[PDB]
Amino acid sequence: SFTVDSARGIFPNTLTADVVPATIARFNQLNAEDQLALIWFAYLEMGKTITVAALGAANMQFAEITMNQIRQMSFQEQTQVMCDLANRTDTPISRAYGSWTANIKLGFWYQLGEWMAQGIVAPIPSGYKLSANAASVLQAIQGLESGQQITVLRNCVVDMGFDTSEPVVVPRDMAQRTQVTIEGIDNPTVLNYMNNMNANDFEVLIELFTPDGALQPPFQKPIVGKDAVLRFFREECQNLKLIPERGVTEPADGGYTQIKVTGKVQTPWFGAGVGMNMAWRFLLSPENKIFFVAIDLLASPKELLNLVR
Amino acid sequence: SFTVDSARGIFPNTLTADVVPATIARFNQLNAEDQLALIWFAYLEMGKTITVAALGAANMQFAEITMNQIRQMSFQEQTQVMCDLANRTDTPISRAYGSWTANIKLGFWYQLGEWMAQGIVAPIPSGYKLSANAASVLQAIQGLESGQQITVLRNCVVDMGFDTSEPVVVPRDMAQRTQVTIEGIDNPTVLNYMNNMNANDFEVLIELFTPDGALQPPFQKPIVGKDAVLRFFREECQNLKLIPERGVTEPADGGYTQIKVTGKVQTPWFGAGVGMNMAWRFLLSPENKIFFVAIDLLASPKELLNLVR
């Protein structure tokens, strides 16, 4: 009667941008000094693109205390803390970082990055050489389209720190809510998944799922059950713009229904500056609830028009 | 024996950018809808220049709660709150805003501005007309050099709300502190004023002043006494870059000494993107303490080379 394991293979010819996890794996072999410098360089040719729209919502007071403690350190001390983070070293600061949600980690580095650009905290050593391995990883990153580039950078940041404040979640006022249109799809479960995402209405959204329903983010394991999925929505999924374009519906065994939708997604971290090409792969129960949805980062815009079996 | 009143006229041929307070005065006559739209337009052609370097230091948790409350409002409700702020209306939100320090007010509008650019909060009405008066004020703003433009915008923002959380102040580590060089000036009181400013070392800095010493910001009244001046330093003066260039020293009556220094200042809100041309006008006591310093926004770069009586 379909498992999460079996559901995650629906629409198998959806070609994903698996260069992204490949490059992350290459990055995770580098030494910490290589990792910091590589991101800095990759940051120098897209850092002015980040926006503050994702902040003001992740609440940073306690993290900012640590940021100011770093700001008071000598450049040798600041360098060591950043290496501790990259190495996932077991230190108090690195444990604190590792406890943070993804948006707080990103805001932490975003602020430190601006402080570095203004000399307020330690820049990357002027005459420091990217190792041969690191130079090749950087070159690979520079060759990716922006949506894949920012995904690599986010995942690299989020994984730092030693692995062991709740964000304010705000549903949009009804008068401003939009309704998507999807060429070839009118199933309200799919339309309302998109619309409640876009309105941050996660309490309505989570009711579209089966009790054991699962959601699989790009290049991640499935998140299983309403509690975990809702937790993921509130922690990470605020102020996305989901812009689906088209989709197809296929019968599935046992009264299930599988739907593929392609389109574009914008993250509040970059706004309209970066449109990532995505696919949503749904498996709906006989009661038309979401038992499984996978969200794929597509290999290229050509995949937006790939709706064949 | 010199008063603050008499001291503020030293070096009188220092030509200031008094177009800045003139344009602020014109702005303060406009209706609230005109004020919001005018800033938005003026913001559209310099908004991507603002940086986050001034945040993470003004601590915004409590202000951000109000920002999220605004984010939840209908566009009609959000519009009214912003008009209340511009009109300095006596409302709870506008009283809260009016109680904030300058950097918190600026961060509040900075975040709302990004949210507006992404549709998260109410944009300016598409078919709204700047009145004839407002169109002329906007044109005047657009014609100013960047340093004067950002000064107009800051003062306009700071004055909103109904007039009735402490920032983390971080002195630079000694190993990173820089020393200015000023062509024609070696008086340590002047050099160390600049150096302690640049290191956020306000407790050392304030000791350079006489007990009754006064500081006059651009187009402001003098701030009088160590307590008030130190308060101003900690609330507003973190992470400036003072880049003095040259200066002159003149004897003054009663064993006093008057010094003029010209150069450039950068604010963390824009980093190196905006260099404001400034003059510092010091009156030093016989004990070589700062009895008075005025900081002038100069009319044009030509004034950097104006050291004549």
Ligand SMILES: CC1=C(/C=C/C(C)=C/C=C/C(C)=C/C=C/C=C(C)/C=C/C=C(C)/C=C/C2=C(C)C(=O)CCC2(C)C)C(C)(C)CCC1=O
């Ligand atoms: C680290 C470092 C730096 C700092 C560097 C910095 C500041 C780096 C920061 C980089 C940032 C801000 C990266 C943000 C990436 C966000 C992405 C890819 C969002 C994707 C969301 C998607 C696809 C949504 C998907 C969704 C859809 C549609 C659903 O349907 C369901 C939900 C779901 C979520 C799945 C320095 C520069 C300081 C140098 C030193 C150093 O080391």
Ligand SMILES: CC1=C(/C=C/C(C)=C/C=C/C(C)=C/C=C/C=C(C)/C=C/C=C(C)/C=C/C2=C(C)C(=O)CCC2(C)C)C(C)(C)CCC1=O
């Ligand atoms: C409002 C509004 C918007 C928002 C607009 C926004 C976000 C506007 C934000 C504008 C910003 C961030 C303006 C910042 C200006 C800072 C300056 C001029 C610093 C000067 C410091 C100096 C000269 C230092 C001087 C110093 C020296 C050297 C000393 O020696 C001693 C100390 C002293 C301090 C004197 C929207 C876009 C949302 C539209 C709606 C709407 O209404």
